Amino acid sequence: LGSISPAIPVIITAVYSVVFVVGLVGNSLVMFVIIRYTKMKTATNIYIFNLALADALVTTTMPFQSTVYLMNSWPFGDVLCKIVLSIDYYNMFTSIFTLTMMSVDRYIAVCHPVKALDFRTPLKAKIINICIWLLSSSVGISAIVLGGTKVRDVIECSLQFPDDDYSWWDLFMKICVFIFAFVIPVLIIIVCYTLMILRLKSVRSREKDRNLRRITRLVLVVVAVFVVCWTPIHIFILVEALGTSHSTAALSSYYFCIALGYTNSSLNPILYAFLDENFKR
Template sequence: MYSSEELWNSTEQVWINGSGTNFSLGRHEDDEEEEGDKHPFFTDAWLVPLFFSLIMLVGLVGNSLVIYVISKHRQMRTATNFYIANLAATDIIFLVCCVPFTATLYPLPGWIFGNFMCKFVAFLQQVTVQATCITLTAMSGDRCYVTVYPLKSLRHRTPKVAMIVSICIWIGSFILSTPILMYQRIEEGYWYGPRQYCMERFPSKTHERAFILYQFIAAYLLPVLTISFCYTLMVKRVGQPTVEPVDNNYQVNLLSERTISIRSKVSKMVVVIVLLFAICWGPIQIFVLFQSFYPNYQPNYATYKIKTWANCMSYANSSVNPIVYGFMGASFQKSFRKTFPFLFKHKVRDSSMASRTANAEIKFVAAEEGNNNNAVN
């Protein structure tokens, strides 16, 4: 039996579990009448899990292909691509270990997986989100280093260094996420019968706010500020005049321009990935802050819908990155074609026919020009 003051923080859990009616974890006078009733089944009870299933399908296939392509082709094993592979690994772990359990909260009236899974899923979700943030920060720092110190970066930016950094990212993410184990637990409640809920339980409102603020700073604000600082440096460096080669060699100039173009494309791809993360995870981070710090916050069906949308946005981030690689990464496109030639056979045939047609047209034009010259002479 819980008092309403002790259970105030638990009220929001009701809205996560698919109910639009009033609810309290304490028992009401008419509990005996409701004991045998079935809980209501709302639209979000099937719509949200369906959307999560689509996210899982796209994300697992896309991120698995990214890791497979990087591991299969030696030329793809660059420092940047190691960070991309690490990012894909965090997305896969998040999709497999966290999304299915969250999806069950909508059709089911309570948590059915026990106390260990309650702590484990919440902890792993925090670890993967934290690892994603630090990996994106490392990628941005890597691109900044290449842009600001292009010659020094040739010595220090190696796949081995990227692998060591990635391992350190995972270790740091596990350490930074340990507080979640202290506060996540099973709570007994009542919703059309006795139920169990997996939620964060804090000793006081001050502890709750401190923890939420810590999560916001460590898993969102600090990485975004660091990334913004890195790209500010990059923009300033790109605006400065480049150093011309000592000799006015055409091939050296061409190679220099090509290198700058490739680096620019890679940097743009990293920028898009970072922006997508900030946009997808921003709503849920801001909502949780508002929920905890706004004194007049009252959970209702409107806030439930906003939080559901924000959760869907954050989970969708794990499936969009491979799409970005496919559209913006030229090296990924080439490697995909090599790995799966049967998918691109028609496109290759069309391009070869187009090139043969173009060659024929060039020869015809050249022959016509030759005939005209002979006629003039």
């Protein structure tokens, strides 16, 4: 309403500090345990490591978001821009696709037990991550070639596209990211875990109910974290691209939604590894 601004940017810089350290320490701790003690000979630990590694590299980009919000410019050239963007995108899909194949692995484990023998092997887990490496590297190479700086008096770092001939490939790219990094994931992880519980509910007394309650609570939480963290920023980006506004509160809310996306990566070590009944022991 007035000239004096509220200390919201200080609060934002403080949340970023928590999410950054919690995420960087957490995921570095998980990898350390797997490298020095578990040796990742099982398919389970292979997923846990690759998720921890992807979430460890996504938090690496986080201080750049923090800095850009407060400075309101990218003065570090196109060379760093291309690097920071590619790391931010590549490991976003590597984080979300590993997270989704864990859902598919747990789904096949219960619903296709004979297939589980031929799918939940250390080799198969490795191949699945080699595929997740390829699918992400496509966006990674795209971020290295298209990433750059634009003068449109505050310097911006983003994927640069030609504006000629009523082009809309900036919007188009965002819709592809929205469906392959949120829509098909959310739906795959919702369908897989729902069908998984439905299978266990269809088993015929206290032992079944004890596991069903523990698993349903776990399932609700893991997807709740993915929905609570990615839904705000995916919608914000998509609506800003279809429209929106560039206010102070609108800029503050955007980087708060950015922080939520990084929160998913910071909670994954606690939600999947420091809750794994095999990783604790």
